[PDB]
Amino acid sequence: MKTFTAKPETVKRDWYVVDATGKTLGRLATELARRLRGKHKAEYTPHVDTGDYIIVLNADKVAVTGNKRTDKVYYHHTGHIGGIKQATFEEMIARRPERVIEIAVKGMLPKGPLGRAMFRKLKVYAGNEHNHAAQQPQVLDI
Amino acid sequence: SRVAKAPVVVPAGVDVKINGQVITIKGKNGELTRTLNDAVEVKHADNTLTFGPRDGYADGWAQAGTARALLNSMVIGVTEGFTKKLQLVGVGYRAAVKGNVINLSLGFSHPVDHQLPAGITAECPTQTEIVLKGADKQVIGQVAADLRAYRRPEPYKGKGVRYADEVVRTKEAKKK
Amino acid sequence: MKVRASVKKLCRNCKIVKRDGVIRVICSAEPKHKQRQG
Amino acid sequence: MIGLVGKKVGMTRIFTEDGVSIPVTVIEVEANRVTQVKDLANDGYRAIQVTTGAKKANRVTKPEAGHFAKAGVEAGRGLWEFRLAEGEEFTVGQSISVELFADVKKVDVTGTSKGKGFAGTVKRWNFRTQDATHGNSLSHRVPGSIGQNQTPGKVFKGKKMAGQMGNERVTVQSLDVVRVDAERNLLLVKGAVPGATGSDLIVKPAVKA
RNA sequence: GUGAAGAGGGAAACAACCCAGACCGCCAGCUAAGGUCCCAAAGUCAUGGUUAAGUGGGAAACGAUGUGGGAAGGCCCAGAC
RNA sequence: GAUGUCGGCUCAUCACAUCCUGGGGCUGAAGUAGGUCCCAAGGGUGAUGCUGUUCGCCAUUUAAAGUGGUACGCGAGCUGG
RNA sequence: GCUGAAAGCAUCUAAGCACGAAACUUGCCCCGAGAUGAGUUCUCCCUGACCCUUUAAGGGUCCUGAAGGAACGUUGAAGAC
């Protein structure tokens, strides 16, 4: 016999909704990533995406400990010689509430085409209203 | 701590209102309120307030002492308020109050007009005097500091806006 | 303001205070006793 | 506030009685016809879409023709949008004329500059030419060095080089309004504006003032 | 001693460091150095402390009421600070 | 079994131990001026006589004529004193 | 700087409340949904059959070809092409 492998055309994916208010950023992000990758399923197979669709609400209310709210810096480079640009956690929340959770989860996911496909299943929202009522998400507590 | 041990005496005519952490004081001078820190136990008693630390909070005594001081200032606030006296020193330095605005002539090329906050009223006995009245100690101190900052007392003649009870300690340039 | 690695009291009126993680000497009698450790 | 769409007619002078010559650009501003009003509820922002001039009925496609017919206006030579401030409102089919600028006295004129084609670095970026003599070998107008050495190992992005010059949208700010002539559909602004004669110009009240 | 003339695991990568020398095959198990939130396998482990700087996760003489302890002192309820 | 040297030229980019402009404390800071230290890279920071010269010294400017890194930046860009 | 304990006092800091520079982020200008995360509004146009099977988001046949676009030509203060 050969070890069972998941088939991309027959995997079962479910929808969940998560409220991010008050949650620690990293401790929420790890759980989000492990469910996006599908590591909670008995059918987990490294080369196929078996994770679920997760909806995150109230991304602007996510919490961090210590002085991270003013001291965590987000660097990126534009590609030009001046280039280096930075933003603190507070600035990111004021401008992009969703971006912080998105990039934390992205940093916790495998790199490569499959990892990007996995990240595609994450729907992050600043408010507590989403447009995906038709997919009937289940309430998931993290 | 041992500042916080001494309870504050609630006199007649003033009442207290507590919702766990946010507190309210009402008296003849008016309305004062704040939210105390999460580590201090506000506890009204027979016409007194007693303050103590909570549990699981390090440095709860320091916060208790701060809360005791603030509430003491509130009680002294809603009754007879607070007063700050400012003096103007220097030739041509004048002050005048126009309703809710203080007009200062401090030797600039432009007029200086200061807008008072909600609870503060000003009154100029002379042009070299500014008397401030209000219930909030912090606000009146802030307003006095803001007025002082326009022309700080320089150390060669003491010219500028000073608190009435202030020492300037002038000095001479080199000699002669 | 004196910026030094070694800040000390210089007279009886000078006092050590730590403001925002910085050791400072503030002195009520002599203005040139002000010091910050940097 | 909104602006209007005109066309660059040419450039002349105005003589003032006190013996001053003012170089002016003559901008013909016909009636601008509002063809669509965009609002926050439907389009997510507030703006009006205007048309001006005329177009040959054979050159207007039934998509464009139907869009014009909905507004009930005649076909123009194009469509432009102006972002609306909080105060003003307009209605579809309304026509706006040049006396909008009756009391403005500074405008911002936007147009497409004249196309210079593929231009060298001396013309495009004001690079200095090298020696004309003294042994110079085939290198009188070339750019010279373009990078450092192994340590960068590459040419930095955004380096100034030869390429297309002109034929791009350019705005000139804070132009004096010299005359508004409603009956002639003329606006006269002090100075030069981008673009060749007969090209479209967008005139707006000065944003910086 | 190791490389030379040695593989493999670890050390982010990294002849010569650590554990440990590869007869061949197995979709068997068990361990060493290193690990057990996630990338990336396995503790979001139990119990007590200790640090708040991101120490951890780069630096000295030299400074400082930053805190967790210990052993000794002086003063003092007539009354210390 | 080849990594062209110096200077100039054309073109640069970055660091901050900031020359100028900006903020501030101390003065043995009256003002005019400064001195010294702290913060701060947004922009700007001479063209000439001699010398192959970098430099230097001049003679006049300027708001100021910064200092270093970049194969002492740059010869499949140029010159070659 | 203000109020303010620890550490009867004090103390810009610990709770809390203010300020403050050509830096920063905007505001001025340009590009920009391959922004694969490819978005938005208005408008225009096509609503005939038949057959064969593996049956599937299947393939042909005949009639039909619309909105539009291209080609070609007269050309351009557009442009190497």
UniProtKB/Swiss-Prot annotation, chain A:
One of its GO terms (cellular component) is cytosol. Pfam families: Ribosomal_L13. GO terms for biological process: cytoplasmic translation; negative regulation of translation. Keywords: Ribonucleoprotein, Ribosomal protein. It comes from the Bacteria. One of its GO terms (molecular function) is structural constituent of ribosome. InterPro entries: Ribosomal_uL13, Ribosomal_uL13_bac-type, Ribosomal_uL13_CS, Ribosomal_uL13_sf. This protein is one of the early assembly proteins of the 50S ribosomal subunit, although it is not seen to bind rRNA by itself. It is important during the early stages of 50S assembly. Part of the 50S ribosomal subunit. Belongs to the universal ribosomal protein uL13 family. This is Large ribosomal subunit protein uL13. It comes from Escherichia coli (strain K12). The gene is rplM.
UniProtKB/Swiss-Prot annotation, chain B:
The keyword Nuclease does not apply. Pfam families: Ribosomal_L6. GO terms for biological process: cytoplasmic translation; response to antibiotic; ribosomal large subunit assembly. Gene3D superfamilies: Ribosomal protein L6, alpha-beta domain (3.90.930.12). It comes from the Bacteria. GO terms for molecular function: large ribosomal subunit rRNA binding; structural constituent of ribosome. The keyword Cytoplasm does not apply. Keywords: Acetylation, Antibiotic resistance, Ribonucleoprotein, Ribosomal protein, RNA-binding, rRNA-binding. GO terms for cellular component: cytoplasm; cytosol; cytosolic large ribosomal subunit. The modification N6-acetyllysine is found at residue 43. PANTHER family: 60S/50S RIBOSOMAL PROTEIN L6/L9 (PTHR11655), LARGE RIBOSOMAL SUBUNIT PROTEIN UL6M (PTHR11655:SF14). This protein binds directly to at least 2 domains of the 23S ribosomal RNA, thus is important in its secondary structure. It is located near the subunit interface in the base of the L7/L12 stalk, and near the tRNA binding site of the peptidyltransferase center. Part of the 50S ribosomal subunit. Belongs to the universal ribosomal protein uL6 family. This is Large ribosomal subunit protein uL6. The gene is rplF.
UniProtKB/Swiss-Prot annotation, chain D:
Keywords: Methylation, Ribonucleoprotein, Ribosomal protein, RNA-binding, rRNA-binding. GO terms for biological process: cytoplasmic translation; ribosomal large subunit assembly. This is Large ribosomal subunit protein uL3. The modification N5-methylglutamine is found at residue 150. GO terms for molecular function: rRNA binding; structural constituent of ribosome. Disulfide bonds: none annotated. InterPro entries: Ribosomal_uL3, Ribosomal_uL3_bac/org-type, Ribosomal_uL3_CS, Transl_B-barrel_sf. Belongs to the universal ribosomal protein uL3 family. One of two assembly initiator proteins, it binds directly near the 3'-end of the 23S rRNA, where it nucleates assembly of the 50S subunit. Pfam families: Ribosomal_L3. It comes from Escherichia coli (strain K12).
